[PDB]
Amino acid sequence: GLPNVSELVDMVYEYCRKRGLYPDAESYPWKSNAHYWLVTNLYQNMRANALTDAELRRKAADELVHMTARINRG
8 A cells, every 4th residue: 555654754764865876766666656756756845845854744645645546546
Protein backbone atom coordinates (compact mmCIF):
# COMPACT_ATOMS: atom_id res chain seq x y z
CA GLY A 1 0.00 0.00 0.00
CA LEU A 2 0.98 3.70 0.14
CA PRO A 3 3.21 5.05 2.93
CA ASN A 4 1.61 6.92 5.82
CA VAL A 5 2.63 10.57 6.36
CA SER A 6 5.44 9.77 8.81
CA GLU A 7 6.85 7.06 6.57
CA LEU A 8 6.67 9.37 3.55
CA VAL A 9 8.38 12.28 5.29
CA ASP A 10 11.18 9.89 6.35
CA MET A 11 11.50 8.80 2.69
CA VAL A 12 11.81 12.44 1.58
CA TYR A 13 14.59 13.08 4.07
CA GLU A 14 16.42 9.88 3.09
CA TYR A 15 16.16 10.84 -0.57
CA CYS A 16 17.44 14.30 0.38
CA ARG A 17 20.41 12.58 2.08
CA LYS A 18 21.11 9.99 -0.64
CA ARG A 19 20.14 11.57 -3.97
CA GLY A 20 23.73 12.71 -4.74
CA LEU A 21 24.84 9.07 -4.99
CA TYR A 22 22.75 8.45 -8.13
CA PRO A 23 22.92 9.68 -11.76
CA ASP A 24 19.44 11.26 -11.64
CA ALA A 25 16.15 11.14 -9.75
CA GLU A 26 14.79 8.27 -11.81
CA SER A 27 17.83 6.09 -10.99
CA TYR A 28 17.21 6.29 -7.22
CA PRO A 29 15.91 2.93 -5.98
CA TRP A 30 12.12 3.43 -5.85
CA LYS A 31 9.87 0.60 -4.64
CA SER A 32 6.98 1.88 -6.77
CA ASN A 33 6.17 4.54 -9.31
CA ALA A 34 4.13 5.98 -6.43
CA HIS A 35 7.21 6.48 -4.24
CA TYR A 36 9.05 8.26 -7.06
CA TRP A 37 6.17 10.68 -7.74
CA LEU A 38 5.37 11.34 -4.06
CA VAL A 39 8.98 11.82 -2.93
CA THR A 40 10.30 13.83 -5.91
CA ASN A 41 7.30 16.18 -5.83
CA LEU A 42 7.66 16.77 -2.08
CA TYR A 43 11.45 17.10 -2.29
CA GLN A 44 11.19 19.74 -5.01
CA ASN A 45 8.48 21.58 -3.06
CA MET A 46 10.70 21.39 0.05
CA ARG A 47 13.68 22.71 -1.91
CA ALA A 48 11.93 25.45 -3.85
CA ASN A 49 9.94 26.72 -0.84
CA ALA A 50 12.16 26.15 2.24
CA LEU A 51 9.39 24.07 3.80
CA THR A 52 9.55 23.49 7.55
CA ASP A 53 9.06 19.94 8.86
CA ALA A 54 5.48 20.73 9.84
CA GLU A 55 4.83 22.29 6.44
CA LEU A 56 6.33 19.26 4.71
CA ARG A 57 4.05 16.97 6.72
CA ARG A 58 0.97 18.91 5.66
CA LYS A 59 1.96 18.80 1.98
CA ALA A 60 2.80 15.09 2.28
CA ALA A 61 -0.64 14.35 3.74
CA ASP A 62 -2.33 16.20 0.87
CA GLU A 63 -0.21 14.38 -1.72
CA LEU A 64 -1.11 11.07 -0.11
CA VAL A 65 -4.85 11.87 -0.28
CA HIS A 66 -4.60 12.70 -3.99
CA MET A 67 -2.65 9.52 -4.66
CA THR A 68 -5.05 7.34 -2.63
CA ALA A 69 -7.88 8.74 -4.74
CA ARG A 70 -5.97 8.08 -8.00
CA ILE A 71 -5.23 4.47 -7.10
CA ASN A 72 -8.78 3.99 -5.75
CA ARG A 73 -10.34 4.72 -9.13
CA GLY A 74 -7.96 2.45 -11.06
